[PDB]
Amino acid sequence: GHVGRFVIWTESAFARLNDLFGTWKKPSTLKKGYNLPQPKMANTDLSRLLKSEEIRKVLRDPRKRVFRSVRRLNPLTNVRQLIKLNPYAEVLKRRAAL
Amino acid sequence: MTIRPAYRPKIVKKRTKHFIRHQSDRYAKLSHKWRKPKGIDNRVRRRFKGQYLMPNIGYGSNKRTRHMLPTGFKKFLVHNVRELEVLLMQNRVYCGEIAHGVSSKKRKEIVERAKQLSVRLTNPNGRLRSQE
Amino acid sequence: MSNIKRKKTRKLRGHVSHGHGRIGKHRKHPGGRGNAGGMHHHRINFDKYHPGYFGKVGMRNFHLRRQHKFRPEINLDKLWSLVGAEKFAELEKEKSTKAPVIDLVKFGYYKLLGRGHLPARPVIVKAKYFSKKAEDKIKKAGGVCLLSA
Amino acid sequence: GIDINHKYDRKVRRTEPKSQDVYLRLLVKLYRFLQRRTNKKFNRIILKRLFMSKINRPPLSLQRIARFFKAANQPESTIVVVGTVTDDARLLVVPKLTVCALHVTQTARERILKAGGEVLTFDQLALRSPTGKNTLLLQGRRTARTACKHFGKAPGVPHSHTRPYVRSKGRKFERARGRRSSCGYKK
RNA sequence: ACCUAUACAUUACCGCUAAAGUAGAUGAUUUAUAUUACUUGUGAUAUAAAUUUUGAAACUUUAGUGAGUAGGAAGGUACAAUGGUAUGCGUAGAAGUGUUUGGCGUAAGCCUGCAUGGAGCUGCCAUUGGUACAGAUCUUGGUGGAUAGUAGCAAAUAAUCGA
RNA sequence: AGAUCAAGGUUAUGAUAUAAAUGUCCCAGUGGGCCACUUUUGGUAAGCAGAACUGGCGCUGUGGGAUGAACCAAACGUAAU
RNA sequence: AAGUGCUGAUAGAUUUAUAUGAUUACAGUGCGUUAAUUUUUCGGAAUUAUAUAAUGGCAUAAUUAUCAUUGAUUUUUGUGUUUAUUAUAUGCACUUGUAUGAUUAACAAUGCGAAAGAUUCAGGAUACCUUCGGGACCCGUCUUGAAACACGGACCAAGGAGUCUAACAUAUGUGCAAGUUAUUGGGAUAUAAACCUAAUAGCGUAAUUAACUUGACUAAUAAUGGGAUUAGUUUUUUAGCUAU
RNA sequence: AGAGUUAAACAGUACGUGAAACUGCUUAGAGGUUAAGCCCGAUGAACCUGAAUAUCCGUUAUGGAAAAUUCAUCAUUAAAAUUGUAAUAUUUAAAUAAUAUUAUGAGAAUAGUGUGCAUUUUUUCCAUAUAAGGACAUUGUAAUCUAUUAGCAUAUACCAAA
């Protein structure tokens, strides 16, 4: 089930494969009505498909940070979050403590 | 002499003890290797108090330190020499154990070759045998 | 020859009652063997899902022979794929030295029906039969539906 | 504690092609990238339709390639079909059109090329119209097929018309009691 | 006041579920410095050093969340064979078996040392089967307690001496 | 009762969305239930018999009631506080 | 209600942030107007105008709208007024500074992976023995309910039970597509394989009647013709957005 | 029981392996409570597994040796590729493309020769300077965040209660 045995063609062997499975242009003569199967993807190179300059004039958003940064502090014991969150509340600290 | 890897973590563990299969104390036919009981009036399946404990995924170890050995390394069964050349630049996450099939003749080379690539073999002094 | 891991028995083994129940065990034949009884204890199953079982509509033909109803069929829908479409372009210049000659019984067909909506060229159709709309919708285009022998 | 999340919080869909086809499982690899970096909805419905079975990618004859195209005003809109384009002999003269398809029957490749236009795999589409400008993305009927004719059946309602699982068409095959008002009843 | 749950809460970890991000690497990015356009000022160029693959079936980010018979679905795992493969292992010791050898796995399981053994065996990719046992008064062989010496060796009159 | 025009402000209670909508396989099992508040019929009563509603047990561990299938708290990934 | 002013303790601290993406925006320190005022004299210290809409305060106009209306409450504000309050007007360098990337790290002590040789500190219900505490009924089964005064089971090794087939139906995979399908046969031939292949034949392509009859849209064109609800491609002009 | 034979008698006619069930013997510790077993936390004994080197307020300051070089400011020379141009032939009339040949050019690349070619270069080992030659682990310590628990209490404002 494993494709690709190492193979050796002779000369007149190799010159008959354009008859057995005929060609891309015309069908075959030695297999009546046979027609070579067409792939679902003819160009099949992704790294040149994605390369590409026909596609990278469309692409929008290369989101380049990660933005994890998560921990919830406490704005009732950590004063430095009070003045980040309610900035006016810094004043009332320096007013009544004054 | 091999430095333990890649600035080692602290391997911590939910249970060390292994799970030991209902009624295996009672019978010599039952192996201690766990079976889930399926049977209806069973207090172990039902998870009664002070019966024992079943497996689940909740005891699953940290995904960093999963399969890590005591030495911070992870195993890699080596079976001949040119499997050690796989560990030429994995000698910093993995470690080799020479198989049980590998004979005393070849092990002397695997031990000497793996001393050059600095890997930490987990069983040298196997088939020593300071003999013929 | 069938991949067994996807069969349930690899998986149900072993929990006890193998998928079939503790209460209502997998017994031998708990409803009847076969189409028993589609007229008493399976009747709901037999009407729905098969209305029309259990009767006789009738005309008995002792030893039907399957040649006296042979009559293969063709609509006007094809009729012109039987000549080449590459032989349709030339009569579509327009230039009518034609109708063509189609001999539908030499192909395999007898009855020429009329589904169709065929083009404005004439045709000459030698088939053994007719529809009412096969005769009209050809002779409107000029040609003639003609009797094969 | 909370009551609840029951089910199905597990939403229901298919998320990779079940074809192990090495050509299809590469056009997916591409079209993942053409819809996460160009957020078109045109390109979702190609990644979504590269996933489905062969039911859900039903054939679409050469005449509906053409019968839809001639609904006009887009004379260079390529016809995008995630599936098969077969051939209609009941169409005689075929217009010159450009076709994107997974598979094209050769009796339709011999005709479209002769007209002559193009036949495109889905990688030549994306290297030409990555955002899908000037394309016509069609699909043939999913319930065209005759397995679907039998769904679902109470004889007793005035609307079923849904096709039993007989073995054979004739009299003395489910045609008597419960279908005719003489024998039994009319369903 | 205080004690008390597998509940509540904040944290670590496992899974699930739901979202979200990454693939121009004859590219991207640093740090300096030479030059520089110079826009005051900041970019572009040269040099020197540096970082920058992932079974994309992968990696990264985020949040919620976990009862279960009967029952269904997924993913693993043991057994044995076939077709390919591992330039596999093996009388310098295969299978098996034992074992306070040492670990791995959440588990099924698995690797390894020593012991015995004495000729074959395995990993992977396919496809398959006479494919996993605690039960069935299951089958067939073996063995325990009882009892390893207990019930018992009591009808038919009876033997004893010395050689 | 309809088919096309013309005019229309700010879309017409509240609070919700652990996604909803829809096919197929009507696929597995099930088609012996018991318990309880309030309602209730037969019986003299019954841990009896039979129904209506809601919740449970069945399938369910943990905390409490010394004890317990259903009571009262509470529903259960491995751990610390 | 305010931080008012703290003092005590507890447990915990993900992170290979490139083992395929900011360590930078913040603020905080150390150099470059002024002048008197004050205080200690060794610092500090204080001071105005410096530009606000000014927000709060006062007076007044003004109007929206109202508990109750003598009034009060407003509302849109607007002006004047001074009483205060707040923010903006800190670049260039430079730190071992704070924050923020699930915010744990600075100081010491103890001890040398130590050539073979070999200790220290932590850990090991691995699989047992010793010592205590807590919990803890026997499994399988049928059952509404089993530890049951329900049935089977003394113990152990081997064996041991959802399969082949036939015909359908659905789902998925694959090939070809109005077709498709060698396989009964034949031919080539390398060997019960593979290959090649004529005439059919099934199934599909057209149906409905008990039957004989009959046989699918106005038309050279048309997806339930027509209608709604339509993903999507084309398209409209409009400010308009990044570049221009 | 010695001895002998064999590679082996732990292959001596249960004749390969030799499992379990059950057990005689040795060694170890222990015994009046769920009958014993068992779960979880610890324990004594025993055995065992794992453990670390380029820095504070740096992969910085600085002196010794050795060898040597396609390295220099090196220079020629010989290749073989790479990359990018151009040309021919294969091509689906053309182009594109793709292959294969031909040729240009740059920088690189080895190998050989080469101011001084060891002049201060160049690859490798040694000196002293700030915290210290650690870099780790096990700990007492310290302050920080999260969740929390107990504690003292500067001060306003409110309603009648005089």
GROMACS .gro file of C-alpha atoms (C1' of nucleotides) in nm, chain A residues 77, chain E residues 10, chain F residues 80-81, chain G residues 8-13 104, chain H residues 140-150:
model
   22
   77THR     CA    1  -0.509   4.733   4.916
  576U      C1'    2  -0.886   3.309   4.560
  809A      C1'    3  -0.369   2.418   4.963
  810U      C1'    4  -0.591   2.816   5.230
  818G      C1'    5  -0.035   4.195   6.365
  819A      C1'    6  -0.031   3.695   6.157
  820U      C1'    7  -0.179   3.298   5.752
  821A      C1'    8  -0.145   3.011   5.318
  822G      C1'    9  -0.003   3.067   4.823
  823A      C1'   10   0.385   3.298   4.383
  914U      C1'   11   0.896   3.596   4.479
 1194G      C1'   12   1.596   3.048   5.907
 1195U      C1'   13   1.550   3.582   5.688
 1196A      C1'   14   1.357   4.007   5.429
 1197A      C1'   15   1.017   4.305   5.177
 1198U      C1'   16   0.624   4.258   4.748
 1199C      C1'   17   0.156   4.084   4.516
 1200U      C1'   18  -0.307   3.759   4.569
 1201A      C1'   19  -0.678   3.555   4.894
 1202U      C1'   20  -0.753   3.598   5.404
 1203U      C1'   21  -0.774   3.652   5.964
 1204A      C1'   22  -0.744   3.900   6.413
   0.00000   0.00000   0.00000
